[PDB]
Protein backbone atom coordinates (compact mmCIF):
# COMPACT_ATOMS: atom_id res chain seq x y z
CA UNK A 1 0.00 0.00 0.00
CA UNK A 2 2.33 2.66 -1.38
CA UNK A 3 2.40 6.29 -0.24
CA UNK A 4 2.82 8.80 -3.06
CA UNK A 5 3.77 12.47 -3.21
CA UNK A 6 2.31 15.18 -5.45
CA UNK A 7 4.92 14.81 -8.19
CA UNK A 8 4.28 11.08 -8.29
CA UNK A 9 0.55 11.83 -8.40
CA UNK A 10 0.93 14.08 -11.44
CA UNK A 11 2.97 11.51 -13.38
CA UNK A 12 0.43 8.77 -12.68
CA UNK A 13 -2.26 11.05 -14.09
CA UNK A 14 -0.10 11.68 -17.17
CA UNK A 15 0.33 7.92 -17.69
CA UNK A 16 -3.41 7.25 -17.61
CA UNK A 17 -4.36 10.28 -19.70
CA UNK A 18 -1.70 9.64 -22.34
CA UNK A 19 -2.01 5.89 -22.82
CA UNK A 20 -3.50 4.47 -26.03
CA UNK A 21 -4.98 1.22 -24.77
CA UNK A 22 -8.16 1.81 -22.80
CA UNK A 23 -10.62 4.68 -22.62
CA UNK A 24 -11.61 3.29 -19.22
CA UNK A 25 -8.09 4.02 -17.98
CA UNK A 26 -8.43 7.59 -19.26
CA UNK A 27 -11.59 7.80 -17.15
CA UNK A 28 -9.68 7.09 -13.95
CA UNK A 29 -7.05 9.62 -15.01
CA UNK A 30 -9.79 12.24 -15.28
CA UNK A 31 -11.26 11.31 -11.88
CA UNK A 32 -7.83 11.67 -10.26
CA UNK A 33 -7.17 14.89 -12.10
CA UNK A 34 -10.34 16.87 -11.27
CA UNK A 35 -12.28 15.02 -8.55
CA UNK A 36 -15.68 15.24 -10.21
CA UNK A 37 -18.36 12.59 -9.78
CA UNK A 38 -18.44 10.07 -12.65
CA UNK A 39 -21.93 11.13 -13.74
CA UNK A 40 -20.74 14.75 -14.05
CA UNK A 41 -17.87 13.52 -16.20
CA UNK A 42 -20.16 11.28 -18.25
CA UNK A 43 -23.06 13.67 -18.98
CA UNK A 44 -24.97 16.89 -18.36
CA UNK A 45 -21.95 19.10 -17.66
CA UNK A 46 -19.80 21.31 -19.84
CA UNK A 47 -16.13 21.85 -19.02
CA UNK A 48 -14.11 24.95 -19.94
CA UNK A 49 -10.60 26.20 -19.34
CA UNK A 50 -10.37 28.72 -16.50
CA UNK A 51 -6.61 28.96 -15.79
CA UNK A 52 -3.34 27.31 -16.65
CA UNK A 53 -4.50 24.80 -13.99
CA UNK A 54 -8.20 25.36 -13.30
CA UNK A 55 -11.32 24.14 -15.08
CA UNK A 56 -14.82 25.66 -15.01
CA UNK A 57 -17.72 23.19 -14.89
CA UNK A 58 -21.11 24.55 -15.96
CA UNK A 59 -24.29 22.75 -15.02
CA UNK A 60 -27.83 23.15 -13.72
CA UNK A 61 -28.50 22.12 -10.12
CA UNK A 62 -29.28 33.10 -13.60
CA UNK A 63 -28.81 30.96 -16.71
CA UNK A 64 -26.30 28.48 -15.29
CA UNK A 65 -24.39 27.23 -12.25
CA UNK A 66 -20.62 27.16 -12.47
CA UNK A 67 -17.92 25.71 -10.26
CA UNK A 68 -14.21 26.34 -10.69
CA UNK A 69 -11.76 23.80 -9.31
CA UNK A 70 -8.01 23.16 -9.58
CA UNK A 71 -6.70 20.30 -11.72
CA UNK A 72 -3.64 18.08 -11.91
CA UNK A 73 -2.99 17.93 -15.67
CA UNK A 74 -3.19 20.29 -18.62
CA UNK A 75 -6.88 21.38 -18.79
CA UNK A 76 -7.01 21.03 -22.54
CA UNK A 77 -5.61 17.51 -22.21
CA UNK A 78 -8.24 16.70 -19.56
CA UNK A 79 -11.17 18.16 -21.47
CA UNK A 80 -10.14 16.34 -24.66
CA UNK A 81 -10.13 13.06 -22.70
CA UNK A 82 -13.65 13.78 -21.47
CA UNK A 83 -14.71 14.20 -25.11
CA UNK A 84 -13.29 10.79 -26.01
CA UNK A 85 -14.82 9.24 -22.89
CA UNK A 86 -18.28 10.57 -23.75
CA UNK A 87 -17.77 9.48 -27.38
CA UNK A 88 -16.95 5.88 -26.35
CA UNK A 89 -20.25 5.75 -24.47
CA UNK A 90 -22.30 7.28 -27.32
CA UNK A 91 -20.74 4.92 -29.87
CA UNK A 92 -21.77 2.02 -27.60
CA UNK A 93 -18.28 -3.78 -12.55
CA UNK A 94 -15.48 -4.60 -14.98
CA UNK A 95 -14.14 -1.11 -14.12
CA UNK A 96 -12.96 -2.31 -10.73
CA UNK A 97 -10.99 -5.32 -11.93
CA UNK A 98 -9.43 -2.92 -14.42
CA UNK A 99 -8.46 -0.71 -11.48
CA UNK A 100 -6.91 -3.73 -9.71
CA UNK A 101 -5.02 -4.91 -12.82
CA UNK A 102 -3.18 -1.60 -12.61
CA UNK A 103 -3.03 -0.73 -8.93
CA UNK A 104 -2.99 -4.02 -7.00
CA UNK A 105 -0.61 -3.73 -4.04
CA UNK A 106 -0.38 0.04 -4.53
CA UNK A 107 -3.94 1.21 -3.84
CA UNK A 108 -6.56 -1.19 -2.46
CA UNK A 109 -9.72 0.89 -1.85
CA UNK A 110 -13.13 -0.62 -1.33
CA UNK A 111 -14.45 1.92 -3.86
CA UNK A 112 -11.98 3.15 -6.48
CA UNK A 113 -14.19 6.12 -7.38
CA UNK A 114 -14.36 7.26 -3.75
CA UNK A 115 -10.60 6.73 -3.49
CA UNK A 116 -9.91 8.81 -6.60
CA UNK A 117 -12.02 11.71 -5.31
CA UNK A 118 -10.55 11.50 -1.81
CA UNK A 119 -6.95 11.59 -3.06
CA UNK A 120 -7.85 14.55 -5.29
CA UNK A 121 -9.08 16.51 -2.25
CA UNK A 122 -5.90 15.88 -0.30
CA UNK A 123 -3.62 16.92 -3.13
CA UNK A 124 -5.73 19.94 -4.12
CA UNK A 125 -5.44 21.14 -0.52
CA UNK A 126 -1.68 20.46 -0.30
CA UNK A 127 -1.11 22.15 -3.65
CA UNK A 128 -3.59 25.08 -3.70
CA UNK A 129 -5.02 25.96 -0.33
CA UNK A 130 -3.39 28.82 1.60
CA UNK A 131 -1.59 28.22 4.86
CA UNK A 132 -4.05 27.52 7.72
CA UNK A 133 -7.28 27.06 5.74
CA UNK A 134 -9.85 24.79 7.37
CA UNK A 135 -10.03 21.52 5.41
CA UNK A 136 -13.79 21.08 5.77
CA UNK A 137 -14.37 24.39 3.96
CA UNK A 138 -11.85 23.44 1.28
CA UNK A 139 -13.53 20.10 0.56
CA UNK A 140 -16.97 21.63 0.14
CA UNK A 141 -15.45 24.42 -1.95
CA UNK A 142 -13.69 22.08 -4.41
CA UNK A 143 -16.52 19.50 -4.46
CA UNK A 144 -19.97 20.76 -3.40
CA UNK A 145 -7.08 8.90 5.07
CA UNK A 146 -3.40 9.08 4.13
CA UNK A 147 -2.00 7.41 1.03
CA UNK A 148 -0.14 10.67 0.44
CA UNK A 149 3.13 12.33 1.39
CA UNK A 150 2.86 15.98 2.51
CA UNK A 151 6.03 17.20 0.82
CA UNK A 152 5.63 19.16 -2.38
CA UNK A 153 9.16 19.24 -3.80
CA UNK A 154 10.14 15.56 -3.44
CA UNK A 155 11.06 13.98 -6.78
CA UNK A 156 8.59 11.56 -8.34
CA UNK A 157 8.84 7.85 -7.48
CA UNK A 158 10.38 6.35 -10.59
CA UNK A 159 10.32 2.68 -9.60
CA UNK A 160 6.59 3.10 -8.98
CA UNK A 161 6.09 4.74 -12.36
CA UNK A 162 7.99 1.97 -14.18
CA UNK A 163 5.79 -0.60 -12.41
CA UNK A 164 2.62 1.18 -13.55
CA UNK A 165 3.91 1.86 -17.05
CA UNK A 166 4.72 -1.84 -17.46
CA UNK A 167 1.27 -2.79 -16.22
CA UNK A 168 -0.53 -0.41 -18.58
CA UNK A 169 1.18 -1.81 -21.66
CA UNK A 170 1.10 -5.50 -20.74
CA UNK A 171 -2.30 -6.20 -19.17
CA UNK A 172 -4.99 -7.96 -21.20
CA UNK A 173 -8.22 -6.03 -22.01
From TrEMBL:
Telomere resolvase ResT/TelK catalytic domain span: 2-147
Domain of life: Bacteria
Name of the protein in question: Telomere resolvase ResT
